[PDB]
Design an enzyme around this catalytic site. Structure first.
Site, PDB file in Angstrom:
ATOM      1  N   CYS B  61       0.818  -1.119   0.109  1.00 58.94           N
ATOM      2  CA  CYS B  61       0.092   0.084   0.010  1.00 58.94           C
ATOM      3  C   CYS B  61       0.775   1.300   0.125  1.00 58.94           C
ATOM      4  O   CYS B  61       1.399   1.849   1.044  1.00 58.94           O
ATOM      5  CB  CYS B  61      -1.076  -0.073   1.188  1.00 58.94           C
ATOM      6  SG  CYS B  61      -2.292  -1.369   1.135  1.00 58.94           S
ATOM      7  N   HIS B  85     -10.827 -14.487   6.961  1.00 61.91           N
ATOM      8  CA  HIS B  85      -9.983 -15.752   7.385  1.00 61.91           C
ATOM      9  C   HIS B  85     -10.636 -16.825   8.086  1.00 61.91           C
ATOM     10  O   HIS B  85     -10.290 -18.003   8.066  1.00 61.91           O
ATOM     11  CB  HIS B  85      -8.909 -15.156   8.330  1.00 61.91           C
ATOM     12  CG  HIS B  85      -9.620 -14.827   9.657  1.00 61.91           C
ATOM     13  ND1 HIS B  85     -10.383 -13.678   9.959  1.00 61.91           N
ATOM     14  CD2 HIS B  85      -9.488 -15.535  10.904  1.00 61.91           C
ATOM     15  CE1 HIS B  85     -10.913 -13.918  10.909  1.00 61.91           C
ATOM     16  NE2 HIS B  85     -10.207 -14.950  11.925  1.00 61.91           N
TER      17      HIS B  85
END
Ligand SMILES: Cc1ncc(COP(=O)(O)O)c(/C=N/[C@@H](CO)C(=O)O)c1O
Ligand SMILES: O=P(O)(O)OCCNS(=O)(=O)c1ccc(OC(F)(F)F)cc1
Ligand SMILES: [Cl-]
Ligand SMILES: [Cl-]
Ligand SMILES: [Cl-]
Ligand SMILES: [Cl-]
Ligand SMILES: [Cl-]
Ligand SMILES: [Cl-]
Ligand SMILES: [Cl-]
Ligand SMILES: [Cl-]
Ligand SMILES: [Cl-]
Ligand SMILES: [Cs+]
Ligand SMILES: [Cs+]
Lengths: 268, 396
Positions: B61, B85
């Site tokens: 990022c 997840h």
């Protein structure tokens, strides 16, 4: 004290089983709970099992979940329950008083301090529902230091090692579980328990009380016939409270009739 | 008697009714056996790759760190099938259920993500799935409830107690205590009685393992820190596990600070609660002074577990991992920032982890640091909540 030892010896002399009701302390309020308990005794209860309201009673079915909730709706706290226990003992010198606890309420302000308070108010035993034998050490040690009987569960599928552990570590009575699952009158035990009862005696265990799903006189008699020292009934008692919340008079009348009938079933 | 230590230092244990001990022993044995079984491992790997889509991306990022000496990567668990997840470990637990000969699944859920994951795994693998959810959560999570029902699961509202996640947890255990011969309890976080904290860690550890390989490939060194939100602790321990022995790597867990720690309206028991015994374990709890279990509060639905996994409490106690909190407002600023600057809509849960990383950067912008945030879920589910807050603010 020796309240369970004395009770079982006296019942043995009368060739009699023990009948032991369970209620939640402070259900449906403190004053009515005290009257309920005195009625249970007057009607023939040989000992008591008394629950302290807990937020997360994960060994209890809906009937007793709802008893916990009613006590909370009345603002009942563990401190108030201990005040109640002190008064119950101040009224009744010899009846064994057992608590049904969850671990967090025992651990919360110190395990040793919990059992010291039990001794101070005159409790005779503590069953911690979510502490298996494997985790029992600090609980049973604190219990015995304070003259409190630690109550162990003997499940229907107990192996020999577990039988020997429960027999060795327990005092007061051995809790003979009727079946898997959680408390409730709507589910009757379906396994013969006489073999477990015989092995517990061989290993010098505290006398056995059968508990879970006991709602009828015939079950009390069956427990005695199987060799147990008696039987515990909770949900069936609590159902009478639930049914009669609107009529304290009818509640006490029905509790008396029920306990009288269940106690009669224990007699020789 | 167990095969593995049920405790992490003083935390953990097996505080369940005696009736459930054979179920826990059976599960532990089956797990230890499975971990040595190449066929089990191959089946699990096959599901993770071809069904769930592993490995997940590691995204650099650049826009959000421009002008600072922070380099920030996001581990993209938001891209896993199901959008969080939770999918990884349900596939492993479903295989354990099959290994033990069981054909029914019980699961608890709060926000509904674990319920959806349990339902999808059960649908895939031919297991009959029943999911307990506090009635208040059922009411506020109708999209997730409908997803679970579409996938053939039974969703059972729980009305007892506070009618929230802790109450669902209790109901799952009540059921299991009378059904364990045929049903497996698919617990949704790295908490509860042993062996669940261990199993859930091992069935989430591919997060950290992949991250380690990916960061070595891209940067030629280990991260300075890995950062993850902590509800019950599954995504965080999944990220942390493979780095525990790499003592140069910081392990930072972020609990929800809610309206602020000082307000008492938070979900940060590890740092601001008190150790108790509940849900089968000794661990830090949200609880009253007289020991009644309380709810966690967060703007983020999925950080509602009122305790924390025992391995986290242990890693904290020895100083291996550090735990911090992030408030609702901080999590919201991080959510908006990632959307606008990276084109990724993050779950409000993992927005807490991102918010802490952004703080690490902004507080010391000339500090050289290589950070990984575990982006444990996507935030599509949260745009309604965010919309309503921004509208109330007069931002829109
Ligand atoms: C998208 C997302 N990120 C993080 C977490 C936090 O869970 P760990 O700490 O990683 O175990 C959750 C939790 N959800 C649970 C509890 O409501 C559930 O769905 O039932 C979540 O849904
Ligand atoms: O008549 P029922 O079916 O309501 O059963 C009465 C139960 N009341 S109690 O206090 O004996 C009791 C005893 C043990 C319990 O859980 C445990 F076995 F896990 F320890 C729960 C309650
Ligand atoms: Cl304590
Ligand atoms: Cl106390
Ligand atoms: Cl009969
Ligand atoms: Cl008789
Ligand atoms: Cl071990
Ligand atoms: Cl220990
Ligand atoms: Cl570091
Ligand atoms: Cl550090
Ligand atoms: Cl630097
Ligand atoms: Cs940068
Ligand atoms: Cs937490």
């Amino acid at each position: 004290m020796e309240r369970y030892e004395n009770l079982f010896a006296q019942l043995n002399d009368r060739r009699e089983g023990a009948f032991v009701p369970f209620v939640t302390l402070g259900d449906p309020g403190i004053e009515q709970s005290l009257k309920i308990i005195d009625t249970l005794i007057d009607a023939g209860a040989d000992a008591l099992e008394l629950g302290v309201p807990f937020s997360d009673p994960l060994a209890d079915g809906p009937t007793i979940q709802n008893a916990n909730l009613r006590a909370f709706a009345a603002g009942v706290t563990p401190a108030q329950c201990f005040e109640m226990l002190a008064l119950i003992r101040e009224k009744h010198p010899t009846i064994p008083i057992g608590l049904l606890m969850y671990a967090n309420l025992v651990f919360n302000n110190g395990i040793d301090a919990f059992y010291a308070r039990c001794e101070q108010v005159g409790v005779d035993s503590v069953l911690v529902a979510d502490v298996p034998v494997e985790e029992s050490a600090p609980f049973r040690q604190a219990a015995l230091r304070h003259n409190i009987a630690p109550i162990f569960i003997c499940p229907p599928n107990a192996d020999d090692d577990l039988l020997r552990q429960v027999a060795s570590y327990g005092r007061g009575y051995t809790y003979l579980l009727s079946r898997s699952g959680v408390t409730g009158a709507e589910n009757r035990g379906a396994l013969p328990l006489h073999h477990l009862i015989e092995k517990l005696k061989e290993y010098h265990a505290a006398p056995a009380l059968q508990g879970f799903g006991i709602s009828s006189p015939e079950q009390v008699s069956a427990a005695v016939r199987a060799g147990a020292a008696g039987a515990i009934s909770g949900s069936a008692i609590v159902k009478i409270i639930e049914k009669n919340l609107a009529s304290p008079k009818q509640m006490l009348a029905e509790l008396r009739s029920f306990v009288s009938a269940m106690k009669a079933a224990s007699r020789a | 008697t167990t095969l593995l230590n049920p405790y992490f230092g003083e935390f953990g244990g097996m505080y369940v009714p005696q009736i459930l001990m054979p179920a826990l022993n059976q599960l532990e044995e089956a797990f230890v056996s499975a971990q040595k079984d190449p066929e089990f491992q191959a089946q699990f790997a096959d599901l993770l790759k071809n069904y769930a889509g592993r490995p997940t991306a590691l995204t650099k990022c650049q826009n959000i760190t421009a002008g600072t000496r922070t380099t920030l990567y996001l581990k993209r668990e938001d891209l896993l099938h199901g959008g969080a997840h939770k999918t990884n470990q349900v596939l492993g637990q479903a295989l354990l259920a099959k290994r033990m000969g069981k054909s029914e699944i019980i699961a608890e859920t709060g926000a509904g993500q674990h319920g959806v994951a349990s339902a999808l795994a059960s649908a895939l693998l031919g297991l009959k799935c029943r999911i307990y959810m506090g009635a208040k959560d059922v009411e506020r999570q109708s999209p997730n409830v409908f997803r679970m029902r579409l996938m053939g699961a039974e969703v059972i509202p729980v009305h007892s107690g506070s009618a929230t996640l802790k109450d669902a947890c209790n109901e799952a255990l009540r059921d299991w205590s009378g059904s364990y011969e045929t049903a497996h309890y698919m617990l949704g976080t790295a908490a509860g009685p042993h062996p669940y904290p261990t199993i859930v860690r091992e069935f989430q550890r591919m997060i950290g393992e992949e991250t380690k390989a990916q960061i070595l490939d891209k940067e030629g060194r280990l991260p300075d820190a890995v950062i993850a939100c902590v509800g019950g602790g599954s995504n965080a321990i999944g990220m942390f596990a493979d780095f525990i022995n790499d003592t140069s790597v910081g392990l930072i867990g972020v609990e929800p600070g809610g309206h602020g720690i000082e307000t008492g309206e938070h979900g940060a028991p590890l740092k601001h609660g008190r150790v108790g015994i509940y849900f089968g374990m000794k661990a830090p709890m949200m609880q009253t002074a007289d020991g009644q279990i309380e709810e966690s509060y967060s703007i983020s639905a999925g950080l509602d577990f009122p305790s924390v996994g025992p391995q986290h409490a242990y890693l904290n106690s020895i100083g291996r991992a550090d735990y911090v909190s992030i408030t609702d407002d901080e999590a919201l600023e991080a959510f908006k920032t990632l959307c606008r600057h990276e084109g990724i809509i993050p779950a409000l849960e993992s927005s807490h982890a991102l918010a802490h990383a952004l703080k690490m950067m902004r507080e010391q912008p000339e500090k050289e640091q290589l950070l990984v945030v575990n982006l444990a879920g996507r935030g599509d589910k949260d745009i309604f909540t965010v919309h309503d807050i921004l509208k109330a603010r007069g931002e829109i």
